[PDB]
Design a protein around this ligand. Structure first.
Ligand code: ZN
Ligand code: ZN
Lengths: 114, 115
DNA sequence: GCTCTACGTCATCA
DNA sequence: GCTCTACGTCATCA
């Protein structure tokens, strides 16, 4: 039987990570490894990884899970991205965690000025 | 016979002004009154009247005539607006021709500021 | 720790 | 005198 790629034990995958993000990952393992499997909102992807609307709205570039906006179902739908995908793109984009942190430095300096 | 609203004489309206912009105005009268009937690109509307993409892209708000982009038919289509409509909406927005010149003063100063 | 876009410039590519 | 949007911030309203 096919096994979880993290633990190599469980055979029952997390429905969301499996069906939406195509990751063969069990629910316990998702919770133990949030550094890979945590689900990030659209707003968090902008803040933390400096991804833009053009990058995040590309359906060819990230898997996403949509849900009703928790503040109101009349507001625009919440979109959730898996950390490992977002992070890998942002690393190619800014040049690794080093690059990302430099970019974070650059912006904070920008903001200190204003 | 229905007559041109500027001259009150011609019976044959400018096809573009009549068909696209709904103005009962003859071609000669349009050439004589560019201050009303001149066709402005999308870009001129932004430059001259500070209208935004959201206003100009509103199909309920301006009549527009599209044409192939004259630089290349692979580029975005040219959009032409009629000055009377664009001007009338810009006067409501900025507070008449006076307010528009003010808004112009402001932005030229902003650009000077940045040097 | 929700999302979209206006506010406004401007280059670049299309 | 061509047009769309990224580049970026951020409030506001949705
Ligand atoms: Zn597992
Ligand atoms: Zn006439």
């Amino acid at each position: 039987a096919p096994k979880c790629i993290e633990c190599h034990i469980n055979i029952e995958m997390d429905p969301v990570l499996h069906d939406v993000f195509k990751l063969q990952v069990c629910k316990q393992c998702s919770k133990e490894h949030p550094e890979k499997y945590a689900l990030l909102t659209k707003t968090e992807c902008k803040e933390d990884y400096f991804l833009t609307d053009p990058e995040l709205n590309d359906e060819d570039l990230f898997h996403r899970l949509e849900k009703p906006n928790p503040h109101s179902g009349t507001f625009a739908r919440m979109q959730l991205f898996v950390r490992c995908e977002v992070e890998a793109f942002a690393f190619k984009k800014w040049g690794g965690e080093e690059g990302l942190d430099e970019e974070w430095q650059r912006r904070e300096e920008g903001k200190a000025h204003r």
